[PDB]
């Protein structure tokens, strides 16, 4: 559910 770092 967490945001990935681009």
């Amino acid at each position, epitope marked *: *559910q*967490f945001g990935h770092d681009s």
Partner: antibody
Amino acid sequence: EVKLVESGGGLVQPGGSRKLSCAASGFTFSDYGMAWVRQAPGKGPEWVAFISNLAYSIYYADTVTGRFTISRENAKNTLYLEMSSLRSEDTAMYYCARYDYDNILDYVMDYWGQGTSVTVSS
Amino acid sequence: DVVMTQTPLSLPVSLGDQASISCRSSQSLVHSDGNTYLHWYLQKPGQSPKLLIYKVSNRFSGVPDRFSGSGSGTDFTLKISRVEAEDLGVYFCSQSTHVPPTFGGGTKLEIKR
């Protein structure tokens, strides 16, 4: 293959501290969010902590917030869990797990280590 | 948190038979991105959970054809077409649509006698 190996468990006094580590291999560590998940005997897994691949985002389960700290060092392929103010109910097997992603969301814990065991007892 | 409820707690089977296990979420698992982040794990004694199925119906690398998953919204099912001895263990469903990710209590696949 993807491999995760946890270390740092052991027997700790209530109110004590412990720092777990997780050594990652077989993938590009800096590309993946990582998590800690714990399991008490007879019980299901319980997610503990999450850290994103560049550590922009950190999340904790309500049961450990204010006592546990997750960190990572991408250059050393290592994930950490700093545990403080330990309590009897923190006794568990602690697993390191990788989060997979396809676009902008870490959405499944796909590979888990074999675990490091933490016992909190006086 | 999202509550994951598995039934039955224990499922007895004979080798070679079919098995189905159920998982119900207290809240819809359809994400805003349109995916349904519902997964299934198998855990054998002394080992960590291994991923079997992710996003309702996708088999993880190396998982045999006899495993399949289905469902929608809040009701999901894991099906084993013909149970092998290596399939015995505790099955967990899990959701990652909402923070925090949560796990069901487990369904133990045991032997009938």
